[PDB]
Design a protein around this ligand. Structure first.
Ligand SMILES: Nc1nc2c(ncn2[C@@H]2O[C@H](COP(=O)(O)OP(=O)(O)NP(=O)(O)O)[C@@H](O)[C@H]2O)c(=O)[nH]1
Ligand SMILES: [Mg+2]
Lengths: 167, 87
């Protein structure tokens, strides 16, 4: 049973915790609760093989940015999240990608670009510009909704497969 | 404005390993317990039935007095790992 260390990164309020909790605890409650650093673990079957998923749910706030170097070094795969109704978070996602590559010093870090909150009608970030960004990054793009659970498993499992391909 | 980031774990089995919260120098046990409970979604419950223990190791655990200033009571030279459990 191989262990996978996943890290959920992105600007504050994009839905990192909601996404993680939806996957681990299979539920969604609308609540305001900024993260410092939370850790989860759940054994799950992916592609006919049970493995251990360690999920580090990080802080979107700049207040806890000094912790980035440490978790980027240990993290094996990163779920780069942004909200489709938050243009700024989409712009911030570029910074996370470059920082991860810088810290790890690798041009092939397992990553998955996630466009969360796809349940909301007020879209300000078109799927096309996100797909093109993911294409340029050479990683997959998955739109999710921690509320409806749409694409949640796909996003995390695709990151796991990405890590497996790299490892 | 001194404070520290501590890791609080629950004595249950719900997929969560721990959830980090902040402990300021003004935080007394009741304050941190309610903060930990909320973070772990224990809003219905009362902080009265809850206890706060610092995990120094697998053999050593520091019981935080019910009205002590957590910032000054905790072993700062040890791991900031705490467990929230029912008394
Ligand atoms: N409609 C909708 N709301 C969502 C979705 N995901 C998260 N939210 C809401 O957006 C708000 C912030 O989500 P949260 O998961 O706390 O964001 P975060 O990225 O973890 N914040 P932080 O970086 O501070 O830790 C919450 O009220 C949450 O319920 C989603 O897919 N759809
Ligand atoms: Mg949060």
């Amino acid at each position: 049973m191989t262990e996978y260390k996943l890290v959920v990164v992105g600007a504050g309020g994009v839905g990192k915790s909601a996404l993680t909790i939806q996957l681990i605890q299979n539920h969604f409650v609308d609540k305001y609760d900024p993260t410092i650093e939370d850790s989860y673990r759940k054994q799950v079957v992916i592609d006919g093989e049970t493995c251990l998923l360690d999920i580090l749910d990080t802080a979107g706030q700049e207040e806890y940015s000094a912790m980035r170097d440490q978790y980027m070094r240990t993290g094996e795969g990163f779920l780069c999240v942004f909200a489709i109704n938050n243009t700024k978070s989409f712009e911030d996602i570029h910074q996370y990608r470059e920082q991860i590559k810088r810290v790890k010093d690798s041009d092939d870090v397992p990553m998955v670009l996630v466009g969360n909150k796809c349940d909301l009608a007020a879209r300000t970030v078109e799927s096309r510009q996100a797909q093109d960004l993911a294409r340029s990054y050479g990683i997959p793009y998955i739109e999710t909704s921690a509320k409806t659970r749409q694409g949640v498993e796909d996003a995390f499992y695709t990151l796991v497969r990405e890590i497996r391909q790299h490892k | 404005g001194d404070c520290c980031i501590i890791r609080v774990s629950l004595d249950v089995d719900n997929g969560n390993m721990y959830k980090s919260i902040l402990v300021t120098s003004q935080d007394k046990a009741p304050t941190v317990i309610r903060k930990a409970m909320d973070k772990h979604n224990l809003d219905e419950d009362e902080p009265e039935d809850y206890e706060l223990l610092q995990i120094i190791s697998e053999d050593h655990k520091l019981k935080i007095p019910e009205n002590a200033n957590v910032f000054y009571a905790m072993n700062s030279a040890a791991n900031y790992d705490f467990i929230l459990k029912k008394r």
